[PDB]
Enzyme design. Structure first.
Site, short mmCIF file in Angstrom:
data_model
loop_
_atom_site.label_atom_id
_atom_site.label_comp_id
_atom_site.label_asym_id
_atom_site.label_seq_id
_atom_site.Cartn_x
_atom_site.Cartn_y
_atom_site.Cartn_z
N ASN B 190 -5.13 1.75 2.75
CA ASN B 190 -4.39 2.05 3.99
C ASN B 190 -3.17 2.98 3.76
OD1 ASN B 190 -4.95 -1.37 4.47
ND2 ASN B 190 -6.13 0.25 5.47
N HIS B 192 -0.61 2.48 1.84
CA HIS B 192 0.59 1.69 1.61
C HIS B 192 0.69 1.48 0.09
CE1 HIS B 192 1.76 0.33 5.64
NE2 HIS B 192 0.51 0.69 5.94
N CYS B 227 8.19 0.01 0.11
CA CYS B 227 8.59 1.31 -0.41
C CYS B 227 7.58 2.25 0.27
CB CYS B 227 8.45 1.38 -1.93
SG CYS B 227 8.58 3.07 -2.61
#
Ligand code: UXG
Ligand code: UXG
Lengths: 267, 268
Positions: B190, B192, B227
């Site tokens: 995704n 991330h 992050c």
């Protein structure tokens, strides 16, 4: 994994993991490169070799094999949960060094989904001095290779043997200050060869990656990145298809560590 | 991999790979953390969830809700060697409206001996606004049929390390690794940053001499903020002691906290 019937090649199956895939839910080229490395290590172990793959004479002379070039062509990236079968073998290329080849297949269809080839040279572990392969070393590993030519890339003037030029400043794109972390290191505390593939790809704009599929990557290894070194990744478009010229160099003095090319197809 | 006989837990075997081990020829704690994630994803798939990028129920997808890690705690007694087979068993339990817990037990496949254990806390979050919330009755009813009803805890001991409050590291840090940035391999499907990357970044500020002379026994990590792919992180560590350390990951610019944790190491 296991050696084939004739004992001259090795096969192993892998189930693609959740953390091994990208945005398209298919394995990244770095996951593929890691699998190629794993099946190569399992082939070496199966035929009696061992942190480094070395013969008895190589260990006596403090000699190791080091990658000079990696070339990978992918037709289809296996999806998450899919099983990929990889077959690998090696061949002596006279006194220059050795070559390891790979064929990737979808386990369900039996269809070839990728192929790879790599060039390896002998180096003294301590002095880093490259050298030709001796007859005594060549005799210890020729019994594990097919004697008749067996090539993953048979084509006349195929891309795997093409000379790669040096990128000229200014680069069209760049990613600066790349540094390895502990996960980037192998069991001998050297940067893993696959990390360099990732660093090369870092300077490709995200829009190319989002709209294209990586088809071919050729990478030359000139010098190692040390654990405390910092790298800059440079890319310039050279081109339905997109081609790029790549250069990895040390952030400070600009010493070349790798050069390569990539070919991408519009999704 | 497969669900166990009662369908309330999942087991899977893994052969430790050459690139998955460190200088001791045994799996790194990041390889272990990746295996824990993989077996968790395979458990979710086996009971009817996922095949989109997130493990969600029907009601969660309708409400744009996802599970997010709040805390990861891992204790390793023996790291499996390269070529060894490790068997991992995992299960989940509802912790009322707070969230859910996923536990793991690691075993050496040859001896049947427990070589590690792990536990994680998960909270519900709206994926667009990033606002945390309690678990609704409608969502809880959809996943309670996949969990054991009686308590089953990888860490049963009263006041164990997995539930300990972690303090915030005070400047100046004894050790630091600055300017850490994720590359594409650090991202999940995704886009991330993978939860295991943060474990690697925490460990980066531990001096190489501690890693060369000690074995990591326990790691507890709190996840406060994600992050982003274009963020830069600083990893800070201070000795609090075996050796114990206090850790802090924060954004390189404004110093916004992304994680805090503790590690316990045994002299080899
Ligand atoms: O990357 C190339 C593949 N070569 C090895 C190898 C050759 C044949 C079969 C298995 C393995 C090797 C040769 C000689 C000493 C040690 C290992 C190095
Ligand atoms: O990481 C925690 C555990 N996960 C659960 C969960 C996953 C999706 C939707 C609801 C619940 C769970 C997974 C598989 C079996 C039973 C429960 C979220």
């Amino acid at each position: 994994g296991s050696l084939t019937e004739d004992g001259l090649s090795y096969k192993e199956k892998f189930v693609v993991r959740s953390y091994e895939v990208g945005s398209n839910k298919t394995a990244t080229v770095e996951t593929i490169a890691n699998l190629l490395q794993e099946v190569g290590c399992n082939h070496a172990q199966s035929v009696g070799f061992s942190g480094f793959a070395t013969t008895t004479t190589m260990r006596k002379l403090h000699l190791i094999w080091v990658t000079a070039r990696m070339h990978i062509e992918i037709y289809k990236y296996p999806a998450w949960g899919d099983v990929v079968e990889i077959e690998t073998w090696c061949q002596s290329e006279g006194r220059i060094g050795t070559r390891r080849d790979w064929i990737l297949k979808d386990s369900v269809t039996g269809e070839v989904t990728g192929r790879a080839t790599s060039k390896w040279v002998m180096m003294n572990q301590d002095t880093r001095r490259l050298q030709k392969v001796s007859d005594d070393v060549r005799d210890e590993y020729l019994v594990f290779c097919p004697q008749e030519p067996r090539l993953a890339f048979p084509e006349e003037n195929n891309r795997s043997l093409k000379k790669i030029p040096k990128l000229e400043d200014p680069a069209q794109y760049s990613m600066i200050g790349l540094k390895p972390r502990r996960a980037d290191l192998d069991m001998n505390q050297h940067v893993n060869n696959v990390t360099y593939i990732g660093w090369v790809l870092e300077s490709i704009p995200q829009e190319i990656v989002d709209t294209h599929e990586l088809q071919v990557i050729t990478l030359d290894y000139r010098r190692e990145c040390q654990q405390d070194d910092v790298v800059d990744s440079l890319t310039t478009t050279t081109s339905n298809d997109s081609q790029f010229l790549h250069l990895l160099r040390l952030s400070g003095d600009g010493q070349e560590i790798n050069r390569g090319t990539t070919l991408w197809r519009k999704k």
